[PDB]
Short mmCIF file of C-alpha atoms and ligand atoms in Angstrom, two decimals:
data_model
loop_
_atom_site.label_atom_id
_atom_site.label_comp_id
_atom_site.label_asym_id
_atom_site.label_seq_id
_atom_site.Cartn_x
_atom_site.Cartn_y
_atom_site.Cartn_z
CA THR A 4 82.99 122.19 122.39
CA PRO A 5 83.92 118.91 120.69
CA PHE A 6 87.15 118.62 118.74
CA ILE A 7 86.90 119.60 115.06
CA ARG A 8 89.78 119.54 112.57
CA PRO A 9 90.59 122.97 111.11
CA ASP A 10 89.89 121.89 107.53
CA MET A 11 86.63 120.25 108.68
CA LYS A 12 85.64 123.42 110.54
CA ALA A 13 86.19 125.60 107.46
CA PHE A 14 83.90 123.31 105.46
CA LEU A 15 81.23 123.55 108.17
CA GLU A 16 81.55 127.35 108.16
CA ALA A 17 81.05 127.43 104.40
CA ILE A 18 77.89 125.33 104.74
CA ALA A 19 76.56 127.55 107.52
CA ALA A 20 77.27 130.73 105.54
CA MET A 21 75.28 129.32 102.63
CA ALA A 22 72.25 129.10 104.96
CA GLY A 23 70.27 127.01 102.50
CA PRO A 24 66.90 125.33 102.89
CA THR A 25 66.38 121.98 104.57
CA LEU A 26 65.85 118.89 102.44
CA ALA A 27 62.16 119.00 103.35
CA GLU A 28 61.86 122.60 102.12
CA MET A 29 63.25 121.65 98.68
CA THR A 30 61.52 119.70 96.01
CA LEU A 31 62.58 116.06 96.01
CA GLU A 32 64.63 116.52 92.83
CA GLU A 33 66.22 119.65 94.29
CA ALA A 34 67.22 117.64 97.38
CA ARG A 35 68.76 114.98 95.15
CA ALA A 36 70.56 117.65 93.13
CA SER A 37 71.91 119.36 96.26
CA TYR A 38 73.63 116.07 97.17
CA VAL A 39 75.14 115.65 93.70
CA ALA A 40 76.53 119.17 94.05
CA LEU A 41 77.76 118.60 97.62
CA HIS A 42 79.86 115.57 96.72
CA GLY A 43 80.53 116.87 93.24
CA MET A 44 82.14 120.03 94.53
CA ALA A 45 83.79 118.56 97.66
CA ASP A 46 85.22 115.19 96.65
CA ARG A 47 88.48 114.37 94.91
CA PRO A 48 88.28 113.55 91.19
CA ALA A 49 87.82 109.99 90.00
CA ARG A 50 90.82 107.74 89.61
CA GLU A 51 91.61 106.52 86.12
CA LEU A 52 90.79 102.82 85.90
CA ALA A 53 91.08 100.13 83.25
CA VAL A 54 87.38 99.25 83.55
CA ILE A 55 84.40 101.46 84.38
CA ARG A 56 81.35 99.76 82.93
CA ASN A 57 77.59 100.13 83.29
CA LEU A 58 75.58 96.92 83.49
CA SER A 59 72.49 95.52 85.18
CA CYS A 60 71.16 92.40 86.82
CA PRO A 61 67.66 91.00 87.40
CA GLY A 62 65.83 92.13 90.50
CA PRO A 63 62.41 91.49 92.05
CA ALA A 64 61.00 94.76 90.66
CA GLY A 65 62.89 94.74 87.35
CA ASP A 66 66.47 95.28 86.25
CA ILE A 67 68.92 96.77 88.77
CA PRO A 68 71.51 99.14 87.25
CA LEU A 69 75.10 98.47 88.33
CA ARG A 70 78.50 100.06 87.75
CA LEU A 71 81.66 97.92 87.65
CA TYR A 72 85.02 99.49 88.55
CA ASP A 73 88.31 97.66 88.08
CA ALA A 74 91.91 98.82 87.94
CA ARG A 75 92.58 95.68 85.86
CA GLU A 76 91.11 94.65 82.51
CA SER A 77 91.59 91.00 83.48
CA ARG A 78 92.04 89.39 86.87
CA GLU A 79 92.00 86.01 88.55
CA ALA A 80 89.23 84.86 90.87
CA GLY A 81 89.08 86.74 94.14
CA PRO A 82 86.74 88.69 96.41
CA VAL A 83 84.46 91.26 94.79
CA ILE A 84 83.43 94.44 96.57
CA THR A 85 79.69 95.18 96.44
CA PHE A 86 79.03 98.84 97.22
CA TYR A 87 75.81 100.57 98.32
CA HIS A 88 75.74 104.38 98.36
CA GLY A 89 74.54 106.65 101.14
CA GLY A 90 71.75 109.22 101.04
CA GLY A 91 69.13 107.98 103.52
CA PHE A 92 67.59 105.62 100.90
CA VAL A 93 66.16 108.79 99.30
CA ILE A 94 69.03 110.57 97.52
CA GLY A 95 72.37 109.57 95.99
CA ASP A 96 73.01 107.40 92.95
CA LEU A 97 75.89 105.90 90.97
CA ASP A 98 77.34 109.36 90.30
CA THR A 99 77.25 110.82 93.83
CA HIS A 100 79.63 108.09 94.99
CA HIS A 101 81.40 107.40 91.68
CA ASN A 102 84.70 109.06 92.61
CA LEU A 103 84.84 107.26 95.96
CA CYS A 104 84.17 103.98 94.14
CA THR A 105 87.11 104.54 91.79
CA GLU A 106 89.28 105.30 94.82
CA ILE A 107 88.26 102.08 96.59
CA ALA A 108 88.93 100.09 93.42
CA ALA A 109 92.32 101.72 92.90
CA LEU A 110 93.53 101.42 96.50
CA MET A 111 92.20 97.89 97.12
CA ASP A 112 93.13 96.49 93.69
CA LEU A 113 89.82 94.60 93.73
CA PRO A 114 86.75 94.99 91.51
CA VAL A 115 83.94 97.13 92.88
CA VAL A 116 80.31 96.75 91.81
CA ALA A 117 78.14 99.69 92.87
CA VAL A 118 74.36 99.18 93.09
CA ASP A 119 71.81 101.70 91.78
CA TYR A 120 69.11 100.52 94.17
CA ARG A 121 65.52 101.78 94.12
CA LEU A 122 64.95 104.90 96.22
CA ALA A 123 62.24 106.21 98.50
CA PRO A 124 59.76 107.89 98.66
CA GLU A 125 58.87 106.34 95.29
CA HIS A 126 59.94 102.89 96.54
CA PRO A 127 59.62 102.62 100.33
CA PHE A 128 61.32 100.13 102.62
CA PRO A 129 62.48 97.44 101.94
CA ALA A 130 62.97 98.26 98.24
CA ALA A 131 66.57 99.43 98.67
CA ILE A 132 67.40 96.27 100.63
CA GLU A 133 65.76 94.06 97.98
CA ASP A 134 67.99 95.51 95.26
CA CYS A 135 71.18 95.49 97.35
CA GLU A 136 70.62 91.86 98.31
CA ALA A 137 69.71 90.77 94.78
CA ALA A 138 72.71 92.54 93.22
CA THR A 139 75.10 91.08 95.81
CA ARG A 140 73.77 87.54 95.24
CA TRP A 141 74.09 88.09 91.48
CA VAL A 142 77.73 89.19 91.81
CA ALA A 143 78.39 86.24 94.11
CA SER A 144 77.24 83.90 91.31
CA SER A 145 80.10 85.00 89.01
CA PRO A 146 77.88 85.84 86.01
CA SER A 147 79.52 85.98 82.61
CA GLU A 148 78.44 89.62 82.14
CA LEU A 149 80.63 90.64 85.08
CA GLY A 150 83.76 89.18 83.51
CA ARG A 151 85.27 88.50 86.93
CA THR A 152 84.98 85.41 89.11
CA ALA A 153 84.01 85.92 92.76
CA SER A 154 85.49 83.75 95.49
CA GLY A 155 83.71 85.91 98.07
CA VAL A 156 81.89 89.21 98.35
CA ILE A 157 82.68 92.31 100.41
CA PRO A 158 79.59 94.41 101.22
CA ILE A 159 80.51 98.04 101.84
CA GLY A 160 78.54 101.25 102.01
CA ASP A 161 78.20 104.60 103.72
CA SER A 162 75.30 105.83 105.88
CA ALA A 163 72.15 104.17 104.51
CA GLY A 164 74.57 102.07 102.48
CA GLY A 165 76.16 100.99 105.75
CA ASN A 166 72.72 99.96 106.94
CA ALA A 167 72.34 98.01 103.67
CA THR A 168 75.81 96.46 104.18
CA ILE A 169 74.81 94.93 107.53
CA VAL A 170 71.37 93.84 106.32
CA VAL A 171 72.86 92.17 103.23
CA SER A 172 75.41 90.35 105.40
CA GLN A 173 72.61 89.17 107.68
CA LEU A 174 70.39 88.04 104.79
CA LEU A 175 73.24 86.16 103.10
CA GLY A 176 74.25 84.70 106.45
CA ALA A 177 70.75 83.24 106.82
CA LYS A 178 70.48 82.06 103.17
CA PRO A 179 73.98 81.84 101.67
CA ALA A 180 74.81 83.06 98.19
CA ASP A 181 77.13 81.09 95.89
CA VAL A 182 80.15 82.39 97.88
CA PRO A 183 80.37 83.81 101.41
CA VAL A 184 80.58 87.32 102.71
CA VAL A 185 84.28 87.39 103.59
CA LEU A 186 84.27 90.90 105.09
CA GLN A 187 81.74 93.69 105.57
CA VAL A 188 82.54 97.39 105.89
CA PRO A 189 79.62 99.51 107.21
CA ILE A 190 80.80 103.14 107.14
CA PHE A 191 78.95 105.50 109.52
CA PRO A 192 75.98 103.10 109.35
CA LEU A 193 72.50 103.40 110.73
CA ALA A 194 72.24 100.10 112.65
CA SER A 195 70.22 101.04 115.74
CA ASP A 196 67.48 103.66 115.79
CA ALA A 197 69.21 106.99 116.42
CA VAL A 198 66.20 108.54 118.18
CA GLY A 199 67.15 109.04 121.81
CA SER A 200 70.90 108.68 121.28
CA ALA A 201 73.28 111.19 122.83
CA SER A 202 75.06 111.75 119.50
CA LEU A 203 71.79 112.71 117.79
CA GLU A 204 71.12 115.48 120.30
CA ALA A 205 74.77 116.63 120.47
CA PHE A 206 75.15 116.90 116.69
CA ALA A 207 71.57 117.65 115.63
CA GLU A 208 72.60 120.78 113.71
CA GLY A 209 75.72 122.12 112.05
CA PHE A 210 77.55 118.88 111.19
CA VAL A 211 76.51 118.22 107.55
CA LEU A 212 74.04 115.46 108.44
CA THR A 213 71.27 117.02 110.53
CA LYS A 214 68.46 115.66 112.67
CA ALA A 215 66.03 117.32 110.25
CA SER A 216 67.52 115.38 107.33
CA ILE A 217 67.41 112.11 109.27
CA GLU A 218 63.70 112.74 109.89
CA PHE A 219 63.09 113.61 106.22
CA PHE A 220 64.73 110.34 105.13
CA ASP A 221 62.79 108.34 107.73
CA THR A 222 59.43 109.75 106.62
CA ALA A 223 60.17 108.84 102.99
CA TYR A 224 61.63 105.35 103.56
CA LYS A 225 59.18 104.17 106.28
CA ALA A 226 61.33 101.43 107.81
CA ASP A 227 59.53 99.28 110.38
CA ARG A 228 61.19 99.82 113.77
CA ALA A 229 60.68 96.13 114.66
CA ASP A 230 62.09 94.77 111.38
CA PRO A 231 65.80 93.82 111.41
CA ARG A 232 65.92 94.69 107.71
CA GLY A 233 65.24 98.27 108.81
CA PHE A 234 67.32 98.26 111.99
CA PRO A 235 69.88 95.45 111.82
CA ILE A 236 70.95 95.92 115.43
CA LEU A 237 67.89 93.67 115.94
CA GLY A 238 69.33 90.88 113.80
CA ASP A 239 71.24 87.75 114.79
CA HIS A 240 74.92 88.68 115.28
CA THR A 241 76.20 85.23 116.27
CA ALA A 242 77.62 84.41 112.82
CA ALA A 243 78.38 87.92 111.58
CA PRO A 244 81.26 87.98 109.07
CA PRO A 245 84.54 89.78 109.83
CA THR A 246 83.62 93.45 110.14
CA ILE A 247 85.14 96.92 109.94
CA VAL A 248 82.86 99.59 111.45
CA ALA A 249 83.98 103.15 110.69
CA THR A 250 82.26 106.10 112.36
CA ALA A 251 82.83 109.84 112.70
CA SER A 252 83.20 111.52 116.08
CA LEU A 253 80.91 114.44 115.10
CA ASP A 254 78.13 112.32 113.59
CA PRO A 255 74.55 112.46 114.94
CA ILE A 256 74.31 108.70 114.19
CA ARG A 257 77.78 107.93 115.60
CA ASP A 258 76.25 106.11 118.56
CA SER A 259 74.38 103.80 116.16
CA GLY A 260 77.75 102.63 114.83
CA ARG A 261 79.17 102.30 118.35
CA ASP A 262 76.13 100.17 119.24
CA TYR A 263 76.68 97.83 116.31
CA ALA A 264 80.38 97.29 117.04
CA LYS A 265 79.61 96.64 120.71
CA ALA A 266 76.96 94.08 119.72
CA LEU A 267 79.49 92.28 117.53
CA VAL A 268 81.99 92.13 120.41
CA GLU A 269 79.19 90.94 122.71
CA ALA A 270 78.52 88.10 120.25
CA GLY A 271 82.23 87.19 120.02
CA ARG A 272 82.72 88.36 116.43
CA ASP A 273 85.90 89.85 115.00
CA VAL A 274 85.54 93.58 114.45
CA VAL A 275 87.73 96.61 113.75
CA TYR A 276 86.13 99.74 115.22
CA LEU A 277 87.54 103.02 113.84
CA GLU A 278 86.06 106.34 114.99
CA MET A 279 87.56 109.18 112.93
CA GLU A 280 88.28 112.11 115.24
CA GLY A 281 87.19 115.65 114.43
CA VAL A 282 85.29 114.94 111.19
CA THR A 283 81.60 114.56 110.34
CA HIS A 284 79.26 112.12 108.71
CA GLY A 285 80.06 111.74 105.03
CA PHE A 286 83.82 112.16 105.32
CA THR A 287 84.43 109.58 102.56
CA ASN A 288 83.06 111.97 99.91
CA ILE A 289 84.54 115.35 100.87
CA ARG A 290 88.16 114.42 100.30
CA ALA A 291 89.06 117.53 98.26
CA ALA A 292 87.29 120.18 100.34
CA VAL A 293 88.53 118.58 103.57
CA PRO A 294 91.86 117.05 102.53
CA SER A 295 92.51 115.27 105.83
CA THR A 296 89.57 112.94 105.10
CA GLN A 297 91.62 111.24 102.39
CA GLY A 298 93.72 109.86 105.24
CA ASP A 299 90.58 108.64 107.03
CA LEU A 300 89.59 106.67 103.94
CA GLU A 301 93.11 105.24 103.63
CA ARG A 302 92.88 103.96 107.21
CA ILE A 303 89.70 102.08 106.28
CA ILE A 304 91.52 100.69 103.24
CA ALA A 305 94.44 99.51 105.37
CA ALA A 306 92.07 97.78 107.81
CA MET A 307 90.31 96.07 104.88
CA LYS A 308 93.58 94.70 103.53
CA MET A 309 94.52 93.40 106.97
CA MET A 310 91.13 91.76 107.55
CA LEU A 311 91.28 90.09 104.11
CA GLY A 312 94.72 88.58 104.71
C1 D8F B 1 72.84 116.40 102.86
C2 D8F B 1 73.07 115.39 103.96
C3 D8F B 1 72.11 114.21 103.81
C4 D8F B 1 72.83 112.99 103.25
C5 D8F B 1 73.73 112.42 104.33
C6 D8F B 1 74.45 111.19 103.84
O1 D8F B 1 75.53 111.33 103.29
O2 D8F B 1 73.95 109.82 103.95
C7 D8F B 1 73.10 109.33 104.91
C8 D8F B 1 72.66 108.04 104.76
C9 D8F B 1 71.75 107.49 105.65
C10 D8F B 1 71.36 108.20 106.77
N1 D8F B 1 70.49 107.61 107.67
O3 D8F B 1 70.32 106.40 107.67
O4 D8F B 1 69.80 108.42 108.56
C11 D8F B 1 71.83 109.48 106.98
C12 D8F B 1 72.70 110.02 106.06
C1 6NA B 2 69.61 106.55 89.83
C2 6NA B 2 68.85 106.57 91.14
C3 6NA B 2 67.46 105.98 90.89
C4 6NA B 2 67.46 104.57 91.46
C5 6NA B 2 67.66 103.57 90.33
C6 6NA B 2 66.42 102.70 90.35
O1 6NA B 2 65.34 103.25 90.73
O2 6NA B 2 66.47 101.49 90.00
#
């Protein structure tokens, strides 16, 4: 059996005892609500911040809702973190990842702008990518409504948001925004197709993220397997920005993150590869129920500070 931390194992046992339905067996809104409750009841509370503000920016389909987080009411020009939540491009929103966002803002002492991108199945691929890209370009333009000047942007996101992180970095690499991507932080990302990977078969059931859920998300989102906006392992890595890839050792899509970090090394790019041992997919948002995952997040934070200077 693979190594599992005792506090992680207790959380897995609680999930197994619940013996709930699969995402596909729920209504779509029930699936979304189950994720709100999962993070809501497992994550640490939000940090108190000087600024937590709802706003929006123009997007190709209409306005994109955003949430700004800042430990400071006023700050000089500097990098701005642009965050994209996980949930397979089907579930999650600004609230499911709100507490994590306040934690990133507090521990980095940088502003964080989270993106409420359009979701599948209502908006299939590449809708989420369109909104993540547009919001990141908007932040990079230092708009007056943001009240903070950006010298650079830092794409960051978990799971599907880690997919969006890499895609955004690739799109902005090809057609620059007003300032560069100075660092990207894909956290347990889907970069290569997980079908056929060893991790997907090893951790198909019992590790929070399941093969069944991955399939449910894929059917709703409908990413083209040949399109680098769906599977950014296919993109051009030769000018990838400085990168931190964080994975979990018990994650069915762990090997997708391994693949991406190896491709960056193969292309000669600077990359920090951190594989958190004995925890699952989603460890960034279960920091109360599994207290050791707070330390995993702090390691990501420390690597970010180092890679930023
Ligand atoms: C209830 C568990 C499902 C949500 C898991 C999650 O926290 O976020 C994910 C984001 C994207 C992908 N994916 O790209 O297959 C899988 C998982
Ligand atoms: C709040 C989650 C729904 C996505 C926001 C949107 O469709 O623009």
